[PDB]
């Protein structure tokens, strides 16, 4: 007929095509309709940040300090550590001379923070460290916040850039800017899980953070031969700032008086997710290529994370590649050409019964995250296997109990790149100039039940 | 009147601000509350990968092969294919001489996998091809997994980087690494939809895959003039390997015996999404500036995806731009400056009644994906229209069936760049050195109903 | 300024300051008396302001130009400070303390 751009007579033709299939799909007296949103009232509350008072010593590199959780709140649901890094000034009297650069290690945060623990009175609840932090961040980070996260945890292409001596071309100094590390805890996992501070007047809530020595937090790299040696006080200007200054911030949530009176004086049961780290095992690809490690876990495991870490140098961390990074052109750091994950294949065995056969490393690397996660890692390593449909979902999903399960093992196979990197003899700026050593780490995430009654906490199932 | 340590006075002040608006929004006896997550038990089950047993033929490039779905499982909800690419090495005896390079085509996966179908005995239920795979990947890609999916399909700066002859300065060879292609089916779209293998003891389920010859997968480019010629066995070393290592894996999920007996012998009704492609039409912008294409579809159409493909060379694929890609500086491929989508405008017509006017190409390119899609494409082309609020939502919504609809047509308009690039005359490294050819492809996603009864499946409507 | 400096302390305090500055104003007969005396509440009262006029000596000493051993050799900066002392009520019951009004 006619078209004007503002008429809607065309939609009637589409509407008139109401056949049997459309009748089955849509329509009906009880059928809901769009363009109408049901509104239901929610609770009346208020949130605000809150200071956390330190109780054990003062922050310092290589030392452990404790902070109590502030009371007089109703629900605590956030926690983050803010730390002001010191200023680094390289000196001309370095042991490496002109061919020497100093730079911050990759992932400064998730480093210098190990055995971060939460305790009720004198009963430990959970703890985590660098491996769990790295795996969880690489596997369950929502896109869009990646820039913010890798700008707040370091990795800003400014602290990780090698800096030559004062007498060389690169005289830039590493800036001293504060960094923020959120602390992944069970109450911080979801809003529905919050610590009932009002309901818990007897248990004392404590957080224990152990820092790391500044010696292993700085990478001292040779520009030419690509060799790493530990840093010393005389190598940098101003000495080593052993003491560091930091805070712990948490967010509390106030609730209405009627709600608190109604909910005060009752028993509650909550489901939480913990961490279990298997003891590290040294792997030597020169002798053997197949390594079997026994796994000993207790509760319903939800996922298994593992990787092989280049443990040759303590200064460099979060290196899950057979070859260490080396200095590159333009005062930058770049990975050598031969830089691949040492793991080739893996399998799981339950009391001499392989539940999962010898699948390829690419399977765990890509296929499993594509289906049972919210993100895919952008770095080599971090091989995972999840028994659940959604790892990030706090609601329970498929899992296998390990308490009633007989002893099980995981078998891994090395790679020709790993076995050739284990032997030294690499040329300059190749990373594998010196012999390399590797270690195997296994992390497990399991469910648990916590009961709150009579103003106290505990694990009924242990 | 203080703010020291823990602060609750500010929270009390904030809570005191209660008025009519706050009373209407929050509060009430029936109002829900946060910090308290309701817990409801779910079913007990387990899942594990399972190999799929080939029944017909051998996996080789250029023909058809089918794999049966393993029985004895309880639910099948995931399927993917693994394929190891061969090793390619250039030879000095190439026809093009020094001015000649060989590289893998862009998007190696989704290519050489055409007419991939799922068959119930001898009745088809779902079939997809390269165009549908590309459109779905570009329009429904969750962020964070984009890099992982890209690495799975290739494009890792090694497959797509041209390699010169051995005698020249650059003599690198294309590595041989396995790649994984997930299979998007109705049961793989959502966890709620899965094949009840226990309920289907008599039906036979097959997955049929057609491969393509390596001639159409390998791109042989001229270094200077940017011309592409078909490859021959004598050009490269090793020869054309017809056979290839490739397998199909699927994930099965066991369930508790308590519920399988209860659900045995019951009628199941499901909704599924299927794809249907209009036949391709050759478009010559030199003779005409507008193209009319008739659509003939059956069921409730969800969306239409259309794009004009540069089909000048069968060697190069997944190219929807008026100018073919050419070799660039630095031993890499660079897209020429003249690179725009040939379509300038598009419109729909219902029995000579214009439902959708001559809207701009940028509308379909950006505005429609912004409002009714989960992602926006990062490449030129892939225009789409949607009849529903959410394309990726499994639940049905706004959709008009074409069974009762009369003949419908789509009108597309070329561009001055397309009409000038259709003829040749371009200089070296310009893309349109040789005359170009274009084709139009239309993809429609529709709904259908699947009924399960008496250990068999049929179409109630058909 | 001499009013606040001398007259108010002479009548409503136990001492008079011996240093420059320290200007005060009390709504009560005795500043140091623990027992309540004349006072007004600012919670019900609307916004109140205090306006202070500077001095020619201050405006000439704010800039530099002073010679040696003059104090105002360098440019000078000043800041205004206001302190208020008020009353409140504390309730002790049930083995705890709090403000019934706050």
């Amino acid at each position: 007929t006619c078209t004007t751009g503002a008429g809607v007579t065309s939609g009637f033709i589409d509407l008139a095509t109401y056949d049997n299939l459309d009748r089955a799909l849509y329509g009906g007296k009880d059928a809901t309709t769009y363009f109408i949103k049901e509104h239901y009232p929610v609770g009346w509350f208020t949130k605000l940040p809150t200071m956390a008072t330190r109780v054990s010593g003062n922050p310092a590199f290589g030392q452990e300090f404790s902070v109590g959780v502030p009371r007089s709140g109703d629900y605590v649901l956030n926690a983050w550590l803010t730390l002001k890094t010191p200023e680094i000034k390289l000196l001309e009297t370095n042991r490496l001379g002109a061919n020497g650069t100093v730079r911050w290690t990759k992932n400064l945060m998730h480093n210098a923070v190990e055995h971060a623990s939460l305790t009720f009175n004198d009963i430990c609840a959970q703890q985590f460290n660098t491996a769990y932090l790295d795996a969880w961040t690489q596997f369950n980070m929502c896109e869009g916040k990646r820039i913010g996260y890798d700008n707040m945890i370091g990795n800003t292409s400014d602290m990780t850039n090698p800096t030559p001596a004062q007498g060389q071309d690169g005289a830039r100094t590493l800036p001293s800017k504060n960094l923020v590390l959120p602390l992944p805890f069970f109450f911080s996992r979801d809003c529905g899980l919050a610590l009932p501070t009002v309901v818990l007047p007897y248990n004392e809530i404590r957080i224990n953070i152990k820092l790391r020595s500044l010696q292993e937090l700085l990478v001292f790299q040779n520009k030419d031969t690509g060799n790493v040696i530990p840093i010393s006080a005389t190598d940098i200007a101003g000495g080593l700032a052993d003491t560091v200054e930091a805070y712990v911030y948490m967010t509390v949530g106030l609730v209405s008086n009627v709600e608190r009176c109604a909910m005060a004086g009752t028993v509650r049961d909550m489901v939480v997710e913990q961490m279990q780290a298997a003891p590290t095992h040294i792997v030597n690809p020169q002798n053997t290529n197949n390594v079997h490690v026994d796994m000993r876990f207790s509760h319903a495991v939800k996922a298994l994370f593992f990787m092989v870490q280049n443990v040759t140098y303590k200064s460099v961390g979060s290196n899950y590649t057979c070859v260490t990074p080396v200095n590159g052109p333009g005062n930058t750091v770049m990975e050598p050409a031969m830089s691949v994950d040492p793991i080739k294949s893996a399998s799981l065995t339950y009391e001499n019964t392989t539940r999962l056969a010898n699948m390829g490393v690419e399977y765990y690397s890509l296929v499993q995250p594509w289906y049972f996660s919210a993100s895919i890692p952008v770095y080599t390593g971090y091989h995972m296997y999840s028994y659940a449909l959604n790892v990030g979902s706090v609601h329970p999903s498929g899992s296998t109990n390990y308490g009633r399960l007989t002893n099980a093992s995981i078998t891994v196979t090395m790679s020709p790149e790993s076995v050739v990197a284990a032997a030294g003899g690499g040329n300059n700026n190749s990373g594998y100039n010196e012999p390399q050593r590797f270690a195997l780490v296994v992390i497990a995430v399991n469910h648990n039940v916590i009961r709150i009654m009579n103003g106290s906490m505990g694990f009924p199932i242990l | 009147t203080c703010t020291t340590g823990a602060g609750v006075t500010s929270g009390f002040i904030d809570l005191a601000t209660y008025d009519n608006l706050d009373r209407a929004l929050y509060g009430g006896k029936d109002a829900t509350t946060y910090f308290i997550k309701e817990h409801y038990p779910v079913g007990w089950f387990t899942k594990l990968p399972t190999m799929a047993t080939r029944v017909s033929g051998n996996p080789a490039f250029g023909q058809e092969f089918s794999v049966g779905v393993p029985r004895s499982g309880d639910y099948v909800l995931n399927a993917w294919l693994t394929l190891k690419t061969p090793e390619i090495k250039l030879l000095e005896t190439n026809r093009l001489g020094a001015n000649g390079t060989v590289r893998w085509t862009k998007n190696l996966m989704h290519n050489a996998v055409e007419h991939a179908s799922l068959t119930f005995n001898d009745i088809c239920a779902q079939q997809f091809n390269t165009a549908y795979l590309d459109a779905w990947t570009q329009f429904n890609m969750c962020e964070g997994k984009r890099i992982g999916y890209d690495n799975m399909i290739g494009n890792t700066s090694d497959m797509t980087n041209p390699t010169p002859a051995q005698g020249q300065d650059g003599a690198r060879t294309l590595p041989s690494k396995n790649l994984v292609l997930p299979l998007p089916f109705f049961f793989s779209r959502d966890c709620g939809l899965a094949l009840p293998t226990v309920v289907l003891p008599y039906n036979e389920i097959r997955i049929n895959i057609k491969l393509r010859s390596l001639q159409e997968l390998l791109v042989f480019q001229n270094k200077d003039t940017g011309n592409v010629i078909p490859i021959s066995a004598t050009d490269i070393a090793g020869g054309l390997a017809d056979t290839v290592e490739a397998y199909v894996y699927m994930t099965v999920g066991l369930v508790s015996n308590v519920e399988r007996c209860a659900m045995a012998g019951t009628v199941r009704d499901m909704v599924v999404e299927q794809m249907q492609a209009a036949p391709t039409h050759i478009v010559n912008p030199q003779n005409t500036n507008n193209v009319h294409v008739d659509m003939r579809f059956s069921h409730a159409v969800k969306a239409l995806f259309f794009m004009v493909q540069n089909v000048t060379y069968k060697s190069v694929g997944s190219n929807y731009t008026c100018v073919t890609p050419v070799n660039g500086p630095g031993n890499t491929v660079m897209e020429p400056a003249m690179s725009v989508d040939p379509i300038k405008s598009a419109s729909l017509t219902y029995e000579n009644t214009t439902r959708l006017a001559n809207m701009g190409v940028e509308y379909y390119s950006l505005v429609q994906p912004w409002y009714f899609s989960a992602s926006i494409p990062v490449y030129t082309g892939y225009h789409m229209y949607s009849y529903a609020l959410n394309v990726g939502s499994v639940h049905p919504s706004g959709s008009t069936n074409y069974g009762r609809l009369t003949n419908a047509s789509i009108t597309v308009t070329m561009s001055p760049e397309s009409v000038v690039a259709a003829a040749g005359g371009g200089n070296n490294n310009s893309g349109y050195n040789e005359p170009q050819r274009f084709a139009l492809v239309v993809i429609a996603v529709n709904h259908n109903v699947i009924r399960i009864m008496n250990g068999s499946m049929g179409f109630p409507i058909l | 300024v001499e009013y606040y400096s001398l007259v108010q302390p002479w009548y409503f305090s136990a001492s008079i300051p011996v240093y420059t500055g320290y200007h005060m104003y009390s709504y009560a007969l005795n500043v140091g008396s623990v027992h309540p005396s004349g006072s007004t509440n600012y919670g019900r009262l609307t916004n109140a302001s205090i306006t202070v006029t500077m001095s020619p000596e201050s405006v000439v000493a704010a800039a530099g130009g002073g010679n040696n051993n003059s104090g105002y050799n360098e440019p000078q900066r000043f800041a205004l400070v206001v302190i208020a002392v008020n009353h409140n009520v504390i309730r002790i019951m049930n083995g705890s303390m709090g403000f019934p009004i706050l």
Binding site: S72, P201, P460, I461 | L15, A16 | R44
Partner: peptide
């Protein structure tokens, strides 16, 4: 203008311990 009212009453800080619950049915197996 009235300014409303909002008292602050801290809700208890106990220094004792009524009874310590014990752990039963361990997952050690």
């Amino acid at each position: 203008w009235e300014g409303s009212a909002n008292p602050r009453r801290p809700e208890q800080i106990s220094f004792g311990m009524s009874d310590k619950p014990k752990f039963v049915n361990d997952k050690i197996g």
